[PDB]
């Protein structure tokens, strides 16, 4: 989905376009001309709000560049099958009806007046004869991402915007499950995204394997579909294509053959189904946090794979030519146990943060050699061994198997960049489970962070022993005004349990409009509620009272959708019934493992002498001006001085404090910040005599030198 939406993007900023600062608020708003040309719901929530959009589902681009949109004309108060594409200019002159407006089977407008969209964002009833154009489907104004949010007609614009922008952040799991309730756009978005491989022509599959599948065409010509396994995407997540068809099975042209990431049977599936219970539980789900059963962790329900790529290259230096080799100066054989003969870790070796991946030695031959040092070399006969060791190592926080390694060598004419000879990149894969700090979210913008992961026995369970797999606080449902998720939960349960509408006495009044083939569904059935035209409130109320009984012969949820839960710890039933159902929960990519930093001491800058480090030490956290005001407000003068002088800039201070802490000595007094001295020595260079006067109006010589020890 993220790939598909990126292609459909409509950027507004960039060369030849308005910049952020020049973009007045008047251009970021919505206009009545966006209806059918550019989705109003989907757009980045950050500063780039309104400058980035997306084509609607039906939008088309005319040769000049103006975005067209289909409409079907009305010859005389009667709808017509043939459609005509109209741009904004041609829309204003004509009159556009609405899709939801009822129409007789013969095309006659049942009502005398129908809601209409007039020239300039004006809507008002008009006689049924004056209408000149009618929409095609109610889903015309929504983008691809927004078109797969069930019950979008019940959410607010803010939530739907977050819901749309989070389906593009989901992460593919190990095993994908199609949503129980989802709009019809699921299938088409997956087919057109290009992830799945679709048979070009009809045929019978002669042989299928985990690597390739060959289809025997009707013309006698063979074709082999090589499908990639465990291939790193751009952002790190893995990509797999597991065939779904079986040997000897006929396949028709255009059918899906294998399911890429986030796909099940060819329909987009970005997450799992979890038995939600909506109630505040012991504060562990306080203010948008989430509580998860331990079943998800132990059964790999929300387990995900992530691939990291590390690469190092050997380049010819002035002193000599760098070479990747298994021999490194003064390192034990255990640290080099996993390195292969070539000097690069062998496939399948489990590495951790710090181990050596590529054995690289660089030449230091033409470097100064201390008289005592080369004397030592002669004393033992020890090899000069000037070569240094800039050996690739796993950056802090990375682990996992080594799935594969590729080596590009100029000796075999692999077309490497000028100046390098050997270039090896090592792929290390880690299987991340779900833990505290990970972000989950439904399709309705209901974000959250995993507050706690309780054991299975602690989770409240239905009367039949089934423990709810997730709990959502109920204080955030009404305030945010995304009641749609409650509706999704109800319809989710009805889809999971399976219903049998009472038909002996005829269709009940509320079920008159239900399609005749929707009156009976088996358990684990899959249902669809297209955006802006789907299950009504009357229909859900009817289905909830007609769900099939459990295998034990008892109906769990009552007519209102609430069920009697048993407390997992106390063991006594909760005084009042609680909501329960299956909600489709994704797994966002703001994982905790990425967001964790710590720095006791690390590499420092060169011009500013401030902390910074490339994953060798995570690097310091900025202490802005606003934090400085907070410290001043408290009257905390000593703490503020430490945060700015001793541990950020005062070079002699940093060394002394680290020697004092390691020992038992008290931390010494801070010195003069390096930032000030730099400012003074750079203000003097503009020919501005700057002096730090003291009492008696005498300058203090800021330059000072004292030799420790």
């Amino acid at each position: 989905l993220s790939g598909l939406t990126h292609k459909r993007r409509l950027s507004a900023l960039g060369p030849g376009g308005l910049s952020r600062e020049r973009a007045g608020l008047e251009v970021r708003d919505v206009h009545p001309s966006h209806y059918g040309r550019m989705c109003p719901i989907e757009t980045p929530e950050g500063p780039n709000i309104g400058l980035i959009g997306s084509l609607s589902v039906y939008a088309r681009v005319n040769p000049f560049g103006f975005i067209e949109t289909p409409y079907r004309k009305v010859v005389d108060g009667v709808v017509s099958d043939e459609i005509v594409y109209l741009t904004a200019d041609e829309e204003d002159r004509h009159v556009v009806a609405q899709a939801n407006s009822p129409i007789d089977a013969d095309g006659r407008f049942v009502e005398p007046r129908v809601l209409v969209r007039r020239k300039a964002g004006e809507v008002e009833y008009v006689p049924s004869s004056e209408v000149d154009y009618m929409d095609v489907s109610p889903r015309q104004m929504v983008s691809v991402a927004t078109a797969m949010i069930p019950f979008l007609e019940h959410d607010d614009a803010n939530r739907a915007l977050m819901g749309a922008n989070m389906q593009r952040q989901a992460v593919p799991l190990v095993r994908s499950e199609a949503p129980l309730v989802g709009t019809g756009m699921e299938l088409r978005a997956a087919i057109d995204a290009g992830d799945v491989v679709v048979a070009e022509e009809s045929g019978v599959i002669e042989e299928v394997s985990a690597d390739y599948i060959t289809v025997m065409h009707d013309n006698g010509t063979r074709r082999t579909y090589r499908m990639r396994k465990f291939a790193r995407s751009n952002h790190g997540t893995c990509a797999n294509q597991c065939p779904i068809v079986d040997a000897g099975d006929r396949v028709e042209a255009g059918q899906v053959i294998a399911d890429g990431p986030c796909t099940d049977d060819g329909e987009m599936a970005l997450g799992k189904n979890l038995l939600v219970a909506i109630m505040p539980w012991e504060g562990h789900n306080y203010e948008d946090a989430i509580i998860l059963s331990n079943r998800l962790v132990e059964e790999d329900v929300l387990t995900s794979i992530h691939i990291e790529e590390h690469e190092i290259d050997a380049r010819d230096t002035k002193l000599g030519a760098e070479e990747i080799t298994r021999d490194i100066p003064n390192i034990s054989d255990e640290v080099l146990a996993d390195l292969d003969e070539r000097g690069i870790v062998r496939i399948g070796a489990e590495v951790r943060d710090g181990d050596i991946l590529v054995g690289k030695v660089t030449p230091k031959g033409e470097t100064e050699l201390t008289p005592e040092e080369r004397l030592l070399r002669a004393i033992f006969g020890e090899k000069a061994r000037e070569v240094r060791d800039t050996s690739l190592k796993v950056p802090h926080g990375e682990s996992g198997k080594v799935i594969g390694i590729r080596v590009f060598s100029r000796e075999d004419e692999d077309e490497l960049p000028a100046g390098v000879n050997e270039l090896v990149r090592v792929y290390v894969a880690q299987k991340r489970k779900i833990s505290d700090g990970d972000k989950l979210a439904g399709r309705h913008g209901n974000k959250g962070v995993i507050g706690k992961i309780l054991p299975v026995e602690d989770m409240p369970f239905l009367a039949d022993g089934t423990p709810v797999d997730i709990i959502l606080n109920t204080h955030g449902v009404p305030r945010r005004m995304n009641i749609g998720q409650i509706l999704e939960t109800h319809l989710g349960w009805c889809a999971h349990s399976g219903w049998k509408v009472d038909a002996a006495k005829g269709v009940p009044d509320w079920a008159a409009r239900l399609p005749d083939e929707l009156l009976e569904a088996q358990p684990n059935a899959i249902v669809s509620t297209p955006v802006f035209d789907g299950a009504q409130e009357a229909e859900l109320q009817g289905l909830l009272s007609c769900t099939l009984p459990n295998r034990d012969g008892d109906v769990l949820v009552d007519a209102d959708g609430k069920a009697m839960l048993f407390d997992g710890r106390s063991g006594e039933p909760f005084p009042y019934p609680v909501t329960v159902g299956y909600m489709y929960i994704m797994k966002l990519h703001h994982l905790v493992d990425d967001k964790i930093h710590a720095r006791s001491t690390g590499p420092y800058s060169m011009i500013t002498q401030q902390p910074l480090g490339g994953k060798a030490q995570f690097g310091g956290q900025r202490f802005g001006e606003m934090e400085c005001w907070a410290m001043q407000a408290y009257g905390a003068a000593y703490t503020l001085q430490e945060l700015l002088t001793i541990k950020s800039d005062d070079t002699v201070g940093r060394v002394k404090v680290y020697e004092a802490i390691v020992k038992g000595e008290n931390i010494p007094e801070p010195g003069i910040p390096e930032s000030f001295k730099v400012l003074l020595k750079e203000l003097q260079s503009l020919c501005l005599n700057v002096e730090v006067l003291s009492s008696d109006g005498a300058a203090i010589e800021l330059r000072e030198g004292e030799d420790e020890d």
């Binding site: 099958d81 019809g184 899906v256 509620t529």
Partner: peptide, 25 residues
């Protein structure tokens, strides 16, 4: 009416017939 042959038949609540199929996205 599933355009793609091998589609999972998911019954839908749609009540209005769509006269135009989704274009190549």
């Amino acid at each position: 009416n599933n355009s793609v042959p091998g589609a999972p038949n998911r019954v839908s609540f749609a009540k209005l017939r769509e006269p135009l199929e989704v274009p190549g996205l």
